[PDB]
Design a protein around this ligand. Structure first.
Ligand SMILES: C/C=C(/C)C(=O)O[C@H]1C(C)=C2[C@H]([C@@H]1OC(=O)CCCCCCC)[C@@](C)(OC(C)=O)C[C@H](OC(=O)CCC)[C@@]1(O)[C@H]2OC(=O)[C@@]1(C)O
Ligand SMILES: Nc1ncnc2c1ncn2[C@@H]1O[C@H](COP(=O)(O)OP(=O)(O)CP(=O)(O)O)[C@@H](O)[C@H]1O
Ligand SMILES: [Mg+2]
Ligand code: NA
Length: 994
């Protein structure tokens, strides 16, 4: 599979040893097929549900829960039947929870979509070849196409492989290579070789790329490469080779579990030690077996107590909402987890024209040579109005409107803009707007024509659907467009050969109209036109021409300049080979300068401002365009990337410059650069690598398969709403409106979503900290179970869930975009915050245990050993006549449990309020700042009473409380929390960080 673009048509045929008129022989096919394999991309890897669930159960916590569920399930079968009945609820609930998550991962992933899978939508099922075993073309499955056999394609055919073109049967071959780039503008292909072996696809003018479509023509080619070796094929490899890290929250979360696990086992260790006496005092007795059940059933309590079971749901319900939210702001986010990382974007690389600008061109300045005499030179600058492609505006000289016709040089400038253009205008009725037909910079040139109808032809007496191509059409009737030498990046220009209409303008007859980048065309001009006369180009006139060119493109105008010229006596037709592009530059020489035109691709209104917020936000911004660097810089200044007088030398690079650099300085340039002029194929992927070495969260934009690898490697690939489907599938976010401003807005909701997200996480996680202390003490003391897994569970999923997801709606700080982007390594809980929940938790742990124990001691509804003998409640039915003297089952009393729980519940609806703000007291940040937070608390409270007052729930979750004494007890136990926190919160004034 050679690199055919540089080799001749004969070279490639010889290489594979194939006959153009015969094709590969059955042997050749067999051989080639074995060596290069089948012409397709490797199959997809969508591992089964079994492999899914297995992963849905690969989390260290989900495991710990599974184990716990088992122990509970095992215990749920160990005691006499009837009275126990509910002891199948504990294991059943846990499992549901787990199972439910497993049910999520399955439906979750199953509806996803690999960007690689999308590529296969580009593989045509069939192709057409010429093989030795027949004379007429064979229509075989693309899959079986091989390097070396002759392929034939025509209009509408999807190119089956990377084909070197041998001969074009039609009069012209045009191809839509958009799926690579996105530009729908078909491209003309040729047959002669392309010298440079390191040429970028865009210049492989004799090549057909697997995946592209044939816009016009029919051609014959020899397959150069196939499968994974094809251009789109190389890309698939890059995209598969690329690995993407976990969201920093997912990182921090996994870490939490990695530690949550060690502590748990550590506790077990400690507990075992606190009750190590059972080795030197327990005389072999019967009850010495009902003790293991204690440790086991307390282990499951320890487990559901340590895990934030509801957290997963709170987070996704939060992100999903934030998602639908960002959507209204035109930011389509794919993959919820991205919302976070988006909030942390350090750098944003944005393509210019589509998103930073509008891609709505319009000529603002023209200029023709007015006078050349000696060193004395005089131009004829003009100005034009009208931003739309709408034929509405006027040409002015010194702000004074003018009749274009009164100028000769202009009538020409006009003819050229009209003839050497493959675009047109069109007026639609649906939305009564004038729409661009061809390419933006051309469709503009036509607009320039209408607005300056040189001949003064009557148009106002015409409808809109004709007013569009009125003056343009007239010019097309004074000259005949024989053929056109298309544009190519070598000569950076284009011409059209023309002959007049007999006896109407046959003065000189055949003319050649060329437009293109100034530098090239001007050098190729030996004469300048001054009206109807011509004069030899001279040093001064040239200098003047250029100077105004640099002003217009370098100055504040930031305009794209097209030099315009004609070849007065073009070569004779018979002397031109119109099918091999290299000779075009030669055919476009000895030209006569007839004037340049400047156009503008206006920055988007909101851009100027958005660029600013990023500055406030400490988010660097990098422009990636196709403009010559000079103009690149100018534009960067016009929008604020750079300061009108800021030094940029070291901050702007052209793709070529960047290449001449060694990996070293190449990385430097990246941490400092803000502008990249003419970026070649791989630059986006490299720049993203460097920005990553400096640990920067970067955002790239792009829309073709060409950019998929970069969009995949970037932390947040950003696709255009109007871009390709492969780009979209490669990106985490899609800009419905293609607007840069949408990116920034998004970054913002990001930062907001996370801030709230950060608190409800802290809220839940801390509770779990305290729940555990309860379970620890309950065991360390030997005291009867203060809280049960089932209760805990309900709490962590429901009672605490609702206020958690309500905190999700906390109002946004006001300086969110004035603070630098959050460091990914920034932990959720540390230092003094660790200390606080360190305390709060400890508090709820004592408050919860004490409360339940209280009902046992000092309570007027079932008193107990105020001497702390309850500690041996295990020993009751044994030595009943010991110190008991009462019912040996009060230890299984429901009230004492509904006590410690109602005290937790409240302590949580309380701690939930302490979480509205990390450091601001409630007298500063009152609870009514989040009506939802209050509304939810009510919903949890009534829900709490639902498990007490109902009748079936009571059996599983105990019997109710007395409201005046039992409940008030609860309050004087919980309510104090708010104080404890406000106290530790106030400690923020004794420190220096606010
Ligand atoms: C959740 C419940 C419990 C009981 C737990 O063990 O959490 C520890 C733990 C694993 C961490 C700690 C917990 O440490 C303790 O509570 C001290 C142990 C004493 C209790 C035993 C009684 C004898 C977190 C919870 O709490 C405080 C306030 O100290 C804060 C933070 O967690 C987060 O930022 C949450 C990340 C989602 C982590 O230090 C975290 O370790 C990390 O790597 C982090 C960065 O994750
Ligand atoms: N249709 C056309 N024919 C001839 N020259 C053209 C042209 N459109 C533009 N030019 C001139 O040729 C030079 C380059 O054209 P090229 O096609 O590489 O530009 P481009 O800026 O449109 C790339 P990008 O689409 O990435 O912005 C331009 O800078 C301009 O001066
Ligand atoms: Mg162009
Ligand atoms: Na990505």
């Amino acid at each position: 599979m050679e690199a055919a673009h540089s080799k001749s048509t004969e070279e490639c045929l010889a290489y594979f040893g194939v006959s153009e008129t015969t094709g590969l022989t059955p042997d050749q096919v067999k051989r080639h097929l074995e060596k290069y394999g089948h012409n397709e991309l490797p199959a997809e890897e969508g591992k089964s549900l079994w492999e899914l669930v297995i992963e849905q159960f690969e989390d260290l916590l989900v495991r710990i829960l599974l184990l716990a569920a088992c122990i509970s399930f095992v215990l749920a079968w160990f005691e006499e039947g009837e009275e126990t009945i509910t002891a199948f609820v504990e294991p059943f609930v846990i499992l549901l929870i787990l199972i439910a998550n497993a049910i999520v991962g399955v439906w979750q992933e199953r509806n996803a979509e690999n960007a690689i899978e999308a590529l296969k939508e580009y593989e045509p099922e069939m192709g057409k070849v010429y093989r030795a075993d027949r004379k007429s073309v064979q229509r075989i499955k693309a899959r079986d196409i091989v390097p070396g056999d002759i392929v034939e394609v025509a209009v509408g055919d999807k190119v089956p492989a990377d084909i070197r073109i041998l001969s074009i049967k039609s009069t012209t071959l045009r191809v839509d290579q958009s799926i690579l780039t996105g530009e729908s503008v078909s491209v003309i292909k040729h047959t002669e070789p392309v010298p440079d072996p390191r040429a970028v696809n865009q210049d492989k003018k004799n090549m057909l790329f697997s995946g592209t479509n044939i816009a016009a023509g029919k051609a014959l080619g020899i397959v150069a490469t196939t499968g994974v070796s094809t251009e789109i094929g190389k890309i698939r490899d890059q995209m598969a080779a690329t690995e993407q890290d976990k969201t920093p929250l997912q990182q921090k979360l996994d870490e939490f579990g990695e530690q949550l696990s060690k502590v748990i086992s550590l506790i077990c260790v400690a507990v075992w030690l606190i009750n190590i006496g059972h080795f030197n005092d327990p005389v072999h007795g019967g009850s010495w077996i009902r003790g293991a059940i204690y440790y086991f059933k307390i282990a499951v309590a320890l487990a559901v107590a340590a895990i934030p079971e509801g957290l997963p749901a709170v987070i996704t319900t939060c992100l999903a909402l934030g998602t639908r939210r960002m959507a209204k702001k035109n930011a389509i986010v794919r993959s919820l987890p991205s919302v976070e990382t988006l909030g942390c974007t350090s750098v944003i690389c944005s393509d210019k024209t589509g998103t930073l600008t509008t891609n709505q061109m319009s000529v603002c300045k023209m200029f023709i040579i007015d006078k050349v005499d000696g060193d004395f030179c005089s131009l004829n600058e003009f100005s034009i109005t009208g931003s739309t492609y709408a034929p509405e505006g006027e040409v002015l000289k010194n702000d004074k409107p003018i009749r274009s016709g009164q100028f000769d040089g202009l009538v020409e400038l006009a003819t050229i803009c009209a003839l050497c253009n493959d675009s047109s205008l069109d007026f639609n009725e649906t939305k009564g707007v004038y729409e661009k037909v061809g390419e933006a910079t051309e469709t503009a040139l036509t607009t320039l024509v209408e607005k300056m109808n040189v001949f003064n032809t009557e148009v106002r007496n015409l409808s809109k659907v004709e007013r569009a191509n009125a003056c343009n059409s007239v010019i097309r009737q004074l000259m005949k467009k024989e053929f056109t030498l298309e544009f190519s990046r070598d000569r950076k220009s284009m011409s059209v050969y023309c002959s007049p209409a007999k006896s109407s303008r046959a003065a000189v007859g055949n003319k050649m109209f060329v437009k293109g980048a100034p530098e090239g065309v001007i050098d190729r001009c030996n004469y300048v036109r001054v009206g109807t006369t011509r004069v030899p180009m001279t040093g001064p006139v040239k200098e003047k021409i250029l100077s105004v060119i640099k002003e217009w493109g370098t100055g504040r105008d930031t305009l794209r300049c097209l030099a315009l010229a004609t070849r007065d006596t073009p070569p004779k037709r018979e002397e031109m080979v119109l099918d091999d592009s290299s000779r075009f530059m030669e055919y476009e020489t000895d030209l006569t300068f007839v004037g340049v035109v400047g156009m503008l691709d206006p920055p988007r209104k909101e851009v100027m401002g958005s660029i600013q917020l990023c500055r406030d936000a400490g988010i660097r911004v990098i422009m990636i365009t196709g403009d010559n660097k000079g103009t690149a810089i100018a534009i960067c200044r016009r929008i604020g990337i750079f300061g009108e007088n800021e030094e940029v030398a070291d901050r702007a690079y052209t793709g070529r410059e960047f290449d001449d650099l060694p990996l070293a300085e190449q990385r430097e340039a990246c941490r400092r650069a803000c502008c990249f002029a003419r970026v070649e194929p791989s630059h986006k992927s490299k720049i993203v690598e460097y920005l990553q070495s400096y640990d920067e969260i970067t955002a790239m934009t792009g829309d073709g398969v060409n950019d998929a690898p970069a969009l995949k490697k970037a932390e947040i690939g950003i696709a255009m709403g109007s871009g390709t489907a492969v780009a979209k599938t490669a990106s985490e976010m899609v800009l419905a409106d293609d607007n840069f401003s949408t990116i920034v807005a998004a970054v913002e909701e990001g930062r907001a979503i996370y801030n709230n997200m950060k608190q409800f996480i802290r809220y839940l996680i801390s509770s779990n900290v305290g729940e555990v202390v309860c379970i620890f003490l309950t065991a360390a003391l030997g005291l009867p179970e203060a809280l049960i897994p089932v209760q805990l569970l309900w709490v962590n999923l429901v009672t605490d869930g609702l206020p958690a997801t309500a905190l999700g709606f906390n109002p946004p700080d006001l300086d969110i975009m004035d603070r630098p982007p959050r460091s990914p390594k920034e932990p959720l809980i540390s230092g003094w915050l660790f200390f606080r929940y360190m305390a709060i938790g400890g508090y709820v742990g004592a408050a919860t245990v004490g409360a339940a124990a209280w009902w046992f001691m000092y309570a007027e509804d079932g008193p107990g050993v105020t001497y702390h003998q309850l500690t041996h409640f295990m020993q009751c039915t044994e030595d009943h006549p010991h110190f008991e003297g009462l019912d040996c089952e009060i230890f299984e009393a429901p009230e004492p449990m509904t006590m410690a729980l109602s005290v937790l519940v409240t302590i949580e609806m309380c701690n939930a309020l302490n979480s509205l703000s990390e450091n601001q007291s409630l007298m500063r940040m009152p609870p009514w700042v989040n009506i939802w937070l209050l509304g939810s608390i009510c919903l949890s409270m009534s829900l709490h009473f639902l498990i007490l007052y109902v009748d079936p729930l009571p059996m599983i979750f105990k019997l109710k409380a007395l409201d005046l004494t039992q409940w008030l007890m609860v309050l004087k136990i919980s309510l104090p929390v708010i104080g404890l926190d406000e106290i530790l919160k106030f400690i923020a004034r004794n420190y220096l960080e606010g």
